[PDB]
Amino acid sequence: RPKLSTKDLALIKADLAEFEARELSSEKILKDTIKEESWSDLDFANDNINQMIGTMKRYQQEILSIDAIKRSSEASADTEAFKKIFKEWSEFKIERIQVTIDLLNGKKDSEAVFKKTYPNQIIFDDVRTNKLQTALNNLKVGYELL
């Protein structure tokens, strides 16, 4: 019987919470390098955005590798649903950071493939977030996303 402990969901709750704060500090940094801010050169940012990415990758696989999150398709409806979105919702935010720092770098590589993989960049943001957000509410983990 695939299923999540009260230990677990409090994991997801914590991990989600961290990733978002990583989303946050990522944004900050991007905004300070772009504006061209005295301490923020292309070297200062990258040691950060780089490490923040992998740290956001980390929490992600902390979640995506929950046993029941693995076995998602044989647990309840509200679970795989959540993984299915959360997989889509988490990448996007990762890619999108990745993509912007590349761009700060001369790297257009990930921007092409960006618009390829996400036809309608906002219509997706919201929709996964609205869906992730329901999906958490349905899981009954009050973590009011951003």
CATH number at residue 94: 1.20.120.1420
- Expressed as residue numbers, the domain containing 34 is 1-146
Resolution (Å) of this entry: 2.2
Phi/psi class of residue 106: alpha, beta or left (left: φ > 0; alpha: ψ in -120 to 50)? left
Of 56, 20, 61, 18, nearest in space to 145 by CA:
20
d(CA 115, CA 120): 8
**Matching residue, tokens 């019987």:** 1
The approach used to solve this structure was: X-ray
Amino acid identity, position 37: E
Q: How many domains does the chain have?
A: 1
CB atoms within 10 A of CB 86: 22
Q: In 3-state terms, what secondary structure has residue 1?
A: coil
